[PDB]
A = this chain, B = another copy of it.
Amino acid sequence: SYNGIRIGQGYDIHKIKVLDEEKTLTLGGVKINNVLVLSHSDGDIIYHSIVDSILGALGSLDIGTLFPKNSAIFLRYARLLIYKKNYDIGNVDINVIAQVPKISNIRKNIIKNISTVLNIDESQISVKGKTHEKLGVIGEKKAIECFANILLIPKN
């Protein structure tokens, strides 16, 4: 059983519809009032990819597989899983690849939200937004995706 330092990378992608001129997206727990997310879940690519990076770091079955609204249940889950396995989080670096919304505007709020739900300091979190040159599925605003990269550090 390996108990050294662990890497995780979560990935998520959700279909969206921008309320331009011809269910509301939540991103890092922040409501995005001009974008709908077309999903059975709440569409929070940031929360879901963070859960997936934790699960991945530790080698668990993923969320859908484990449990066959929901985003907070899973994040609390992931936090308590790191605890029971005797790890702390080192830092997490999140890349949201999204033509809309702009992330810089809501970045402080996402970071505080993550830090509360993971119970870690704001200095252990980075959330960055990248547009996609208005090319492809993302750049045409049909979808948004997120990569979350995390290190877990063995306690003591």
Contact = CB atoms under 8 A, between A and B. Distances in A.
Interface in A82-116: 90-91, 93, 95, 97, 104, 107
24 contacts: A5-B5, A5-B90, A5-B153, A6-B90, A7-B93, A7-B149, A8-B126, A8-B149, A9-B147, A9-B149, A10-B95, A12-B130, A14-B133, A52-B95, A52-B128, A56-B93, A56-B95, A56-B128, A56-B149, A59-B122, A61-B104, A62-B128, A65-B104, A133-B137
B11 A126 contact: no
Chain A binding surface SS class: mixed
A46 interface: no
A77 to B, nearest CB: 16
Interface in A44-83: 52-53, 55-62, 64-65
Q: How many monomers of this chain does the complex have?
A: 3
